[PDB]
Amino acid sequence: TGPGNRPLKSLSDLLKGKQGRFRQNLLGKRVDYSGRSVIVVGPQLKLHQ
Amino acid sequence: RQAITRAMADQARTIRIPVHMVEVINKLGRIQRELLQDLGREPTPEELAKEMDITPEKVLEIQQYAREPISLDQTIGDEGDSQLGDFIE
Amino acid sequence: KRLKVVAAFQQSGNSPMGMVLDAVPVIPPELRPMVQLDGGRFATSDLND
Amino acid sequence: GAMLDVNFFDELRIGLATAEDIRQWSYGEVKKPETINYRTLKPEKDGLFCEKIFGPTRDWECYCGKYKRVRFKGIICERCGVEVTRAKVRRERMGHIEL
Amino acid sequence: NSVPGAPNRVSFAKLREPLEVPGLLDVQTDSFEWLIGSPRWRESAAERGDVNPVGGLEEVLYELSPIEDFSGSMSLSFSDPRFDDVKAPVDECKDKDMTYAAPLFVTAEFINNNTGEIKSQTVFMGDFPMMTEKGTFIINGTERVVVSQLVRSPGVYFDETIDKSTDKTLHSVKVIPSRGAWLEFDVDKRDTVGVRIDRKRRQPVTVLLKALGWTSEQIVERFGFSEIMRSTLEKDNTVGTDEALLDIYRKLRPGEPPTKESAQTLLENLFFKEKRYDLARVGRYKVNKKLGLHVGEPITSSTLTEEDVVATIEYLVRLHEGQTTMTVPGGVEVPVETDDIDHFGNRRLRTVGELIQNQIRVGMSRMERVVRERMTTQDVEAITPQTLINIRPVVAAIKEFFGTSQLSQFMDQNNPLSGLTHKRRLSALGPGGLSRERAGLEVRDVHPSHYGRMCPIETPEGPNIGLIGSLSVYARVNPFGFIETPYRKVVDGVVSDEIVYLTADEEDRHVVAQANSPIDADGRFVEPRVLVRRKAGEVEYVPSSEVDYMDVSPRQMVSVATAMIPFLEHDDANRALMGANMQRQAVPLVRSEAPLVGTGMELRAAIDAGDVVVAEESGVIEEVSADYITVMHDNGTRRTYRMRKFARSNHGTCANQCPIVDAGDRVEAGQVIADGPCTDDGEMALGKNLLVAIMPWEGHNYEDAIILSNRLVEEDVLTSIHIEEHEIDARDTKLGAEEITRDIPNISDEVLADLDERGIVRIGAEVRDGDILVGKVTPKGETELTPEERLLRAIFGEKAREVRDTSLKVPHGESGKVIGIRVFSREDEDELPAGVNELVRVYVAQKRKISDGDKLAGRHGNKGVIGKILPVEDMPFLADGTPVDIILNTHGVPRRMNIGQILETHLGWCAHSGWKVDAAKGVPDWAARLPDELLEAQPNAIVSTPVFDGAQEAELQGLLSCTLPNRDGDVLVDADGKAMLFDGRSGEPFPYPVTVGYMYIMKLHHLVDDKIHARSTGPYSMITQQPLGGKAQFGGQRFGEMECWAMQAYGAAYTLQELLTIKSDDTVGRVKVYEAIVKGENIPEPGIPESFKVLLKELQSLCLNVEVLSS
Amino acid sequence: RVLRGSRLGAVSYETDRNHDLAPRQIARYRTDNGEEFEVPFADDAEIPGTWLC
């Protein structure tokens, strides 16, 4: 442990995927060219818009 | 005791500091705690400087030398899924 | 259950002598950096300790 | 083995790594638990950031500074002791610890 | 009534509630002044028994004194904690970041036994925080709120989980104290006992009883009926006390040579020596009440007793025999029964006083083991208590509590109601309490003892349902940490007024009536049979002879927020929950209109929010302004209330207070004298009153969306101010010193036009994304130039300017005026963190209009992002040309069971147009039991239907049938409550009448501008080479595993390779792609990702030979 | 709010000229346990006798 009694994070824990006994989510890479927002219904659009 | 304090000087910081700088920093620490108990508040830079016969310029330099690195693997969010390393441009 | 690992070492061209570690390797310095936040503070990688 | 990692991966084989390989990857026994000179903020010799082993922290620049251009590459300043080359070999090279 | 500055809000309530709503912040303020020992508490305790009142600090010191060395030759003792006045007043604390505190002085005392002396001083104990008048701690200038917490009260607990594999009932027990070691007294599958002590996995009870100082004959004697006891005592296979003592020992800890004589102390030192085992005063009270041991004497000596252990075991065996009552020797017989660890008779409430006392205790322990530590290293006949006492652990413990502790939260103040409701919060999660995942589905449920104590409706709808509650309106915390509740004790069917605060347990013993019971105007009931709440929460009809406690008034089972939902009893608990959680998220508008329809709570819970300047002592206004009011009291002395004008809240919302009186008026004490953020004339007002239809108009209001009139945007009916706090500092670097000034590296003069002569912007200058809010420059040193750069510098003849440019440019997508600048300086002697010289903060403000994407939502949970802001002309208008403000959808009404919105809509139209019940020939039948002074009601007249006692549906129809016309002969709303809206766009009328009405809708704090975000190339993480994360920086949205699955299921390979290689990790791929786009070439083929290479070196670091093989 | 760091090393970005390079010798050193290691030194440089290979 270090300060705050948090166990030091060794090499066995730095493996990125590293599923333990229970299968948790990967959650990925944070791509660029991205962006979110809130949506609103667009009833004048065509289906492919 | 001399061996153990030597060891605590050498092998106790991630960025090693020679022994004499550790002695001056520990003198600074003693003077800060005792002057805290006495003044009732944590003393000032110039106050500690005048107290240790050094410059109030130099005291800040010693304080900067005496700052230990904070780990890059402390989960920043209370919801712990983001290492602190994931937030350094 | 023993034959499992035994045939594992036999069949392959390995040798169980590799299990006892004689020389530890050191991960490259960049994968365990010591970056400084602006303002003198340092941020190690917790493997340096 | 194709370590240069360009588009060709027909297999990716694992295997328990003996000492004869572990000390064959490494580019120098690190033998001082020193991280950075507290004041100059350069890596310590034989430390866990030793430029002599892991590589140069500055693109095409030795440690003593006696070489500072691409025209001197692949060579090693015989006084400081660093392969004057790109500053991302600190991302690839490894060191070992003779127990 | 009963509040002098009240607006006359007529009310439909049929009942006359005896008790008035309590001092809504008592749960905070009384707890803290307990912990202090203020004279207010000092008298309040005496007002109800309280044999010995002891302040929290007093209790901590009286459990610390004395401090004695191993020798016991010298003694240290504390006493008399006294607070001097605070060191900085509240506003200045909040300004300069000073944590509003006050010093502790503690009259220590050192006594040497061998020779005999006293070393009595007045020690300084440390700057102690101090609750403000609003029950909120200010910390470092921020304003925090310690949250009340729930835990299982330490006591004796009893359960029997049936082993169907055996078909036997397995009773058990856990004596869990506040601190110490557990112990269970099971009854195994086999007909024996299980006596696991301190988690040591196995024991028969007879072993413990023998170790306790019993013989086998003594145990046979004391256990006469005890069948399983005598059985185990026959298979106990261990005789002689010492004989087990060693059993116990040996297993007490493995690997130790026992001293059979000496380990006796270890036992009498786990459960009895009152320094390492202390179920607190709560625990002792609980045990003595469960076993009826010390029934009539004061509680103390919190450690267990052999009588306690024997009584527990005997009661356990009688429980696993089938019994009704056990009569311990010397104790009143008490009912034999198992306990429920969720029932509020066992789930106490560590209020803020309790929490702070725990932290001071955990600090004083460290201080104790430095006192007794240096108690001997120092030389005797020379020490002073000042040299013994070290306060640093205490001060560190406190300071690390208030900051950085999941019960010390930022005061969630984005309106007075949220400020009020973060206080009065019960959170079962926290240190000591159970965590989230470890907490099963059981505790989330609503045990029927929560009635009247913890509101079953209000709770966070996220993944914390049940783990965060708010208190009922009338509840009150038991001095032990239980949640008492008021009742009206009734005798002989004669409802008295002797208001009794029944706790969580004694409610079960009784039978509890209902508030809406037909009292016969004297305390006599009317009907013979009455509903009642029996012990386990079952409902029955008892005749009016058993009923001994009736509810103080309805809406007793409902929290502060949920009491403010009109027509609550019509909505389903789902949407009512969502409403009570979205009603704490409205943002304080610039205009702050009060609602046509409400409950009673809009006023009382608005002066209790704190954010309404209240006339202290009754007097006369002497002079006003938009900044201060000077009330001349009746006798001489005056007072000037300083308005908070545009203070940034903790979430970016304005906090104006404009005064609402005139220079000649006369205010009574306790009166509202200055509106707050969301108060209108004192009462709550979290939104506006907007004419609403209920038709689905042109698909834009599709599936919870909303269309709006543009009138909202023109007349600023929905318009929030926002005030963001930007902050940069000038640090001391190794190379030099950072410097704030107009001197900047290569830069135009236009972008440095708004700055003043010394860096910081000019107060008032409008800014936009990319402006220089604080011109700040730092040295850079030297770098070997690029020779092309050197040629350009030559051809233009510019210098190097080795100072690098790190100025405070306003972040992306922010604008608006610069309200004010607050600048600090090390030179000006103001304190700052080390290595800092000049800390400048630039308060910026912007007046966000409403806009599509924003999240409006009624009071009934019915929410939805604004869909489209129609122009005013193409909005379905009434017959008077009056447009409609918003247009909800019908398909959201039925399947959500929130017809509260419809009933509110009709009652709002009645409250608007004003009605006049034609009492020409007597009074109409529906209005037989309406209150008087509701026969006629003026236009725009507010009303109020309190929660579970409000307008009945019949009353609504009856009002609505007579709804007096507007200006022409025009009753725009037919008796059904609808109208013939004319289409604004096409022109024809709609073929069927549509509902209209005034529905009170808030503006939730999920504005678009706080959400929208985009990135094309931004910063990059240091450790991993990925884009950075979150809207704080640019960052890019996560691309998890589920999206990888989706884009594979499509079979899109190249897009997946893109998203995982040359948008996240291909380090040389990024610049190549950016070049390819900018020049118009072809996007190159992506290289190996970066995370793979890092993973490869980590695996090779684990001594795992990993090696690519080409062929 | 942003917090940026920086490794203590500059980033010079010329082009990786593969042709015009300062010529350099090769000195093969031997450790004690019969190991041969090779070191490209600059031409004009006293090839040091010992070396931490």
Ligand SMILES: C/C=C/C/C=C(\C)[C@H](O)CC/C(C)=C/C=C(C)/C(O)=C1/C(=O)C=C([C@H](C)CC/C=C/NC(=O)OC)OC1=O
């Ligand atoms: C060098 C590999 C050694 C063995 C693998 C180990 C020890 C890993 O522990 C498990 C594999 C793994 C996880 C590595 C994660 C890495 C390298 C990393 O940083 C990520 C990442 O965290 C996520 C992703 C993708 C977004 C994951 C998408 C998965 C899709 N699966 C699918 O398509 O369904 C069939 O890529 C990465 O390179």
Ligand SMILES: [Zn+2]
């Ligand atoms: Zn060099």
